[PDB]
Design a protein around this ligand. Structure first.
Ligand SMILES: *[C@@H]1O[C@H](CO)[C@@H](O)[C@H](O)[C@H]1NC(C)=O
Ligand SMILES: O=C(O)[C@H]1CNCC(O)(O)[C@@H]1O
Ligand SMILES: [Cl-]
Lengths: 383, 74
């Protein structure tokens, strides 16, 4: 059902983003239609005018999951028309003080929601005016998802085909356009209770980040930072869940330059490995350093051997495991055996490495994920 | 045997992700919560959000297409 929001509602959202050092992207209502089913930009014009008066630095999307519009509002908007609508919105932004803002879309569902024709006709029509192509992904239905589903490499692997199908459409219409996961998580319908909000959620989240980076996705937008759905990073008491801590550790250690790692074992898909240059905005590490992250979905400890010539380097381990008694269904996580908690409402804890003895294999316990920084790697691609 | 050998490709960046690679959403549905003002006002929530800077915050979801801006409304 339709509902209105106030200048106050815009101010609260803007200030949250601004004071948190985040870049706000605001989804405009795409179901405001003329008799001819053109997009009606008049409400959006009011909003752009208000945000202008305030000096708000905001970027834009138009519509959410347009593939669902027939299901959700008994209105069918083909991709050609939605493309035409993005072109009108782009002309508005150019004729506003938002001339230099970004426009993203079209926020289509994943390939399994049979969205290929809508995305292709959209990119043919309106692809010239979008700064990135946005699409959505969920692995599972929140109502039916099981604990085994969250630990299943066969579930994780389906994401690879989803990404290849999106790139196939984009390559055919706007080759070299940036591709964003504009909205993504474990399980649709608000998440899976006691799964989407636990240590168990981290296998899907860290693997999606690893595959997204490896396969050429530029940005991944986690559904949600905070809200009603069980896939929230922060719960209703404002307490960070295990995926929040995973996300913070990822940010601190993983750089923008994506490399590749692979297991020589010919099978399982149970041991999943990703390799980037180390984040150099991080002051403990230097140019050339590598960050390996790994998931172990085996039910035993696995020992990773670094290849030549990295096999005698100093390595800092950052191993995440649940705080008991609830194991993988825990909402509390330990980093190298120390529980991660806010020090107080204004202060995050240090994220303390465990240095390993040089030349040791990397120990990864059953049902665990870990970052490993290879110090003094001296990788010229990371210099 | 529980020992696994890794192969690494290190010759060149295969991709360059944004510094904002790990970004977050707030569902447009939250703006229909009476507590919306209290929640996003939380200094605690702001501390946690700052931890993920740099990032995009996407405001959107099903409710995107069922929200109307009222410059009259308080
Ligand atoms: C691991 O899973 C197998 C099933 O192949 C089971 O029989 C075995 O007991 C499990 N081992 C441990 C250490 O839990
Ligand atoms: O959990 C879900 O099913 C998602 C799907 N995408 C739209 C949404 O983000 O508003 C919704 O919450
Ligand atoms: Cl919500």
């Amino acid at each position: 059902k339709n509902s209105t929001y106030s200048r106050s509602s815009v101010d609260v959202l803007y200030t949250f983003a601004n004071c948190s050092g985040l870049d706000l992207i605001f989804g405009l209502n795409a179901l405001l239609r003329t008799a001819d089913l053109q997009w009606n930009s008049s409400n959006a014009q009011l909003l752009l005018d208000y945000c202008s008066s305030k000096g708000y630095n905001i970027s834009w999307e138009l519509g959410n999951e347009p593939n669902s519009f027939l299901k959700k509002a008994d209105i069918f908007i083909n991709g050609s028309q939605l493309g035409e609508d993005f072109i009108q919105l782009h002309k508005l932004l150019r004729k506003s003080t938002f001339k230099n803002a970004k426009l993203y879309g079209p926020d289509v569902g994943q390939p399994r929601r049979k969205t290929a024709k809508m995305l292709k006709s959209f990119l043919k029509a309106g692809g010239e005016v979008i700064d990135s192509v946005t699409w959505h992904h969920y692995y599972l239905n929140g109502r039916t998802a099981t604990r085994e589903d969250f630990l299943n490499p066969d579930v994780l692997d389906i994401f690879i085909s989803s990404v290849q199908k999106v790139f196939q459409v984009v390559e055919s219409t706007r080759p070299g356009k940036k591709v964003w996961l504009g909205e993504t998580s474990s399980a649709y319908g608000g998440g899976a209770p006691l799964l989407s909000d636990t240590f168990a959620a981290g296998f899907m989240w860290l693997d999606k980040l690893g595959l997204s980076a490896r396969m050429g996705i530029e940005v991944v937008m986690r559904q949600v930072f905070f809200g009603a759905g069980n896939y929230h990073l922060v719960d209703e008491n404002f307490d960070p869940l295990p995926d929040y801590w995973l996300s913070l550790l990822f940010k601190k250690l993983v750089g923008t330059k994506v490399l590749m790692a692979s297991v020589q074992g010919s099978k399982r898909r149970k041991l999943r490995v990703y390799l980037h240059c180390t984040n150099t905005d991080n002051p403990r590490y230097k140019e050339g350093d590598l960050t390996l992250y790994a998931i172990n979905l085996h039910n035993v400890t696995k020992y990773l051997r670094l290849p030549y010539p990295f096999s005698n380097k100093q390595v800092d381990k950052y191993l995440l495991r649940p705080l008991g008694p609830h194991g993988l269904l825990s909402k509390s996580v330990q980093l190298n055996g120390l529980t991660l908690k806010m020090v107080d409402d204004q202060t995050l804890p240090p994220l303390m490495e465990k240095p390993l003895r040089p030349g040791s294999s990397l120990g990864l316990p059953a049902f665990s994920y870990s970052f490993f920084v290879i110090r003094n790697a001296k990788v010229a691609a990371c210099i | 045997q529980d020992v696994v050998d890794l192969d690494f490709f290190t010759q060149e960046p295969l991709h360059l992700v944004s510094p904002s690679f790990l970004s977050v959403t707030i569902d447009a549905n939250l703006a229909t919560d009476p507590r919306f003002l209290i929640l996003l006002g939380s200094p605690k929530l702001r501390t946690l959000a700052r931890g993920l800077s740099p990032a995009y915050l996407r405001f959107g979801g099903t409710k995107t297409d069922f929200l109307i801006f009222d410059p009259k409304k308080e």
